[PDB]
C-alpha cells in the first residue's frame, strides 16, 4: 500500500503544541522549541478561528531553518479543514494572463469560505410509461407508491431533448431542473455486452416520490469565476478569469453574499492567506496589499521571510525583510530563534520517528553535531541516506560508521563550495 | 443508499412479472454442454454489467449542479439592464428603467444604426 502523499519535509508537523491556555509545550504534536513563536502562532490562530476583525498580518522571520514554514504548516494543521488556508509562494502571482495584482485579489478571495445551504423539492421515481399525442401523461414509480402526472409542452420538450425511457429513474424539481439520475434494475441487462459511459444500473428509490433534499457545500469567495463568463462554472478548472472586473466582483458578489447571510442560505467563514517567501513580491504588490488589508472582508496574512536588510524587487531601495516600511507598519512581526544543541537533536529524533529510522545514541549525537556545524535541514537528509545505506548493509539500526559513510558521499553546501578551487 | 448490491442483480434475473390491467370504478433435443456454456456466459455478462455500473457512479462531482445554479446569478451580473423578468411579483422588475435599456445598443442595433455607412464605405 502506498498513498499519493508519503512523508515530505513538513510531515511530522501534525499540529501546534499549545495547551488550552496557549502555553507552548517543549515537545508536543511534532513541534519542538520556538516557545514564543509558537505561542504567537496560537494567538493568531485564535483570531483566525474567531473571524471578527479583518486585515491581520503576522510576519514570522528568522535564520534559514528556524521553523517559519514549520510554524505555518502547524497553524494550517491546527486550523480545521473547514476554514480555508491558501498557502502560496511569493512567485505564484507572477502570471502572464493575470497581472501582479489580479492574481493577488484571486488569492485573497480564495481564502474566504462560504457555507452554502440549499433546499429543493425533488420528485424522483422510476418511469413506467411515457405517452405523447401535444400533451401526455407520466407514470412514475417507487418501491413504496406510484402515481400519474400530467405533462405539458414545456415538460414534453424536456422529456424529448433528454431521451428518457421507461425505467429511467428520473429526478424532477420545481422549475423542472430534470436530471437523468439513474436507470431501473428490473430491465435486467438492457446492455448485454456494451453499455454507455454515462449509464449505470441503480436500485429503485424508496419513500415517497416527493422528497426534500438538503445540500450543503463550502465554496470560496473566489466563486466570482462561476459568473465571470457564460461558461458552466468549468472556468474554475483552468486559467479562466484574468480581468477581475471590479464592478461585477464587488457590487454583485459582496452584495449577494451579504443578502444570503441575511436569508440564512450562506455564511462567510474567513480563512488565512499564507504567502511563503513573500520577499519576492515587488513594491507594486506591497503597495496594493497596503490598501487591500483595509477592506471590509479580508483574510489574515502570514509571511515567512529570512531576508535581512536587502533590496526590494523593482527598486534600488533596501528595507528590513526586503519589503517597504509602509507595509511593515501594517504587519505583526514574530521571531523564530535559532535552535540549540538540544532542540536540533529533538527534531532529528522526531523526524526519525516518522520514517521509523531507528538510530543509535552515538549516531544521534554525531548527527546532531553535524547538523549544528553545517545546517539543520542537511541533518534531516542524512537520516534517510544512512537508513538506505544500512539497509543494503543487511542491518537494522543506523550506526555512527554508517552516518560517516554517508557524510562523505553527500557533501554539504559549505564543503561543496570549499571544493570549488579547480574553477573548471 | 441504493447502490444495487451484486446479489440484488442476480436475484432480478428471475422471470419477469406480468403487467396490470386497471379498469376500476368506485370510491427431446438437448445439449448439456451448450446449456453450461450459455449459463457461464450469462454469469460473465451479469458480472460485467455490475462492474460497469459500479465503475460509472464512483466519482462524485466537484460542485455538482445545485451549487452552480445557486452561485450562478442571472446571466447579466452587473450589466446596466436587467435579466428576463417573468413578472412584477419579483423585485428584479422594478429595478431597471427602459430608458437605461435604450442607452445600450446591441450589435444588431449597431447594424441598424450604421447601415448607411456599412453600405457606402465597405
Amino acid at each position: 500500500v502506498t498513498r499519493i502523499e508519503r512523508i515530505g519535509a513538513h510531515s511530522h508537523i501534525r499540529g501546534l503544541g499549545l495547551d488550552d491556555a496557549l502555553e507552548p509545550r517543549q515537545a508536543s504534536q511534532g513541534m519542538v522549541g520556538q516557545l514564543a513563536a509558537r505561542r504567537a502562532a496560537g494567538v493568531v490562530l485564535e483570531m483566525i478561528r474567531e473571524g471578527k476583525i479583518a486585515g491581520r498580518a503576522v510576519l514570522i522571520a528568522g535564520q534559514p531553518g528556524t521553523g517559519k514554514t514549520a510554524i505555518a504548516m502547524g497553524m494550517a494543521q491546527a486550523l480545521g479543514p473547514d476554514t480555508p488556508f491558501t498557502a502560496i509562494a511569493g512567485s505564484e502571482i507572477f502570471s502572464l494572463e493575470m497581472s501582479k495584482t489580479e492574481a493577488l485579489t484571486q488569492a485573497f478571495r480564495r481564502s474566504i469560505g462560504v457555507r452554502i445551504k440549499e433546499e429543493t423539492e425533488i420528485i424522483e421515481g422510476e418511469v413506467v410509461e411515457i405517452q405523447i399525442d401535444k400533451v401526455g401523461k407520466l407514470t412514475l414509480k417507487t418501491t413504496e407508491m406510484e402515481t400519474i402526472y400530467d405533462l405539458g409542452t414545456k415538460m414534453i420538450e424536456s422529456l424529448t431533448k433528454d431521451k428518457v425511457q421507461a425505467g429511467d429513474v428520473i429526478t424532477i424539481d420545481k422549475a423542472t431542473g430534470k436530471i437523468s439520475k439513474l436507470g431501473r434494475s428490473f430491465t435486467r441487462a438492457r446492455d448485454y455486452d456494451a453499455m454507455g459511459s454515462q449509464t449505470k444500473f441503480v436500485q429503485c428509490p424508496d419513500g415517497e416520490l416527493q422528497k426534500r433534499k438538503e445540500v450543503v457545500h463550502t465554496v470560496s469567495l473566489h466563486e466570482i469565476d462561476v459568473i465571470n463568463s457564460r461558461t458552466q462554472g468549468f472556468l474554475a478548472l483552468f486559467s479562466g478569469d484574468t480581468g477581475e472586473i471590479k464592478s461585477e466582483v464587488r457590487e454583485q458578489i459582496n452584495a449577494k453574499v451579504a443578502e444570503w447571510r441575511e436569508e440564512g442560505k450562506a455564511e462567510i467563514i474567513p480563512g488565512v492567506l499564507f504567502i511563503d517567501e513573500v520577499h519576492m513580491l515587488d513594491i507594486e504588490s506591497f503597495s496594493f496589499l497596503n490598501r487591500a488589508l483595509e477592506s471590509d472582508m479580508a483574510p489574515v496574512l502570514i509571511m515567512a521571510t529570512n531576508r535581512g536588510i536587502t533590496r526590494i524587487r523593482g527598486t534600488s531601495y533596501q528595507s528590513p525583510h526586503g519589503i517597504p516600511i509602509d507595509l511593515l507598519d501594517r504587519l505583526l512581526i514574530v521571531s523564530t530563534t535559532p535552535y540549540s544543541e538540544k532542540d536540533t537533536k529533538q527534531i532529528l529524533r522526531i523526524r526519525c520517528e516518522e520514517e521509523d529510522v531507528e538510530m543509535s545514541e552515538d549516531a544521534y549525537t554525531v548527527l546532531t553535531r553535524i547538523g549544528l556545524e553545517t545546517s539543520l535541514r542537511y541533518a534531516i537528509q542524512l537520516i534517510t541516506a544512512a537508513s538506505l545505506v544500512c539497509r543494503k548493509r543487511k542491518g537494522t539500526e543506523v550506526q555512527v560508521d554508517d552516518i560517516k559513510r554517508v557524510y562523505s558521499l553527500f557533501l554539504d553546501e559549505s564543503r561543496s563550495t570549499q571544493y570549488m578551487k579547480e574553477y573548471q | 443508499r441504493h447502490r444495487l448490491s451484486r446479489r440484488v442483480l442476480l436475484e432480478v434475473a428471475t422471470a419477469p412479472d406480468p403487467p396490470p390491467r386497471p379498469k376500476p370504478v368506485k370510491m427431446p433435443f438437448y445439449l448439456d454442454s451448450l446449456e453450461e456454456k450459455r449459463k457461464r456466459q450469462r454469469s460473465e455478462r451479469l458480472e460485467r454489467i455490475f462492474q460497469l455500473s459500479e465503475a460509472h457512479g464512483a466519482l462524485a462531482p466537484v460542485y455538482g449542479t445545485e451549487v452552480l445554479d445557486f452561485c450562478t446569478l442571472p446571466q447579466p451580473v452587473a450589466s446596466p439592464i436587467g435579466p428576463r423578468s417573468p413578472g412584477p411579483s419579483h423585485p428584479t422588475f422594478w429595478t431597471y428603467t427602459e430608458a437605461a435599456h435604450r442607452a445600450v445598443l446591441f450589435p444588431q442595433q449597431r447594424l441598424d444604426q450604421l447601415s448607411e455607412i456599412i453600405e457606402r464605405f465597405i
Binding site: E144, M145, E146 | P22, P24
Partner: peptide, 18 residues
C-alpha cells in the same frame, strides 16, 4: 404512502369480481 397499498388491495377485489 400506506393509503396506496390499501387502495391497491381494494382495486384487486373489483377486478377479481368483474
Amino acid at each position: 404512502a400506506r393509503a396506496f397499498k390499501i387502495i391497491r388491495e381494494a382495486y384487486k377485489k373489483y377486478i377479481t369480481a368483474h
